[PDB]
């Protein structure tokens, strides 16, 4: 976590920091995206 | 409903009070699983007890 590194996702691939979020998601939601289609928060499948 | 050959099952379960007729109220649906079989289906039945 922290780091300025490159991301390759399951359906997201650029380059970001990982930081903490506050948000309650959906169970069945994996990832998360913003407005104008831009994914901004990913969920982990091993740790909730 | 089938797109593609992928299968999507959408549950939702939710307590109500009914004599009769249908909920006018809204409410949503959330998936349960994924069934990928990947045939074309025309027609379909209901089971009962």
Known sequence: KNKCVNFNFNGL???????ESN???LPFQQFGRDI???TD????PQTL | KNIDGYFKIYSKH???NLVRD?????????PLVDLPIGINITRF???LA
């Open chain 1, 13 to 19: 691939t650029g380059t970001g920091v990982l930081t």
């Open chain 1, 23 to 25: 948000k309650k998601f």
């Open chain 1, 36 to 38: 104008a289609d831009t």
């Open chain 1, 41 to 44: 928060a990913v969920r982990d």
């Open chain 2, 14 to 16: 939710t307590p109500i």
């Open chain 2, 22 to 30: 249908l909920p006018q109220g809204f409410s949503a649906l959330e």
């Open chain 2, 45 to 47: 039945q209901t089971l």
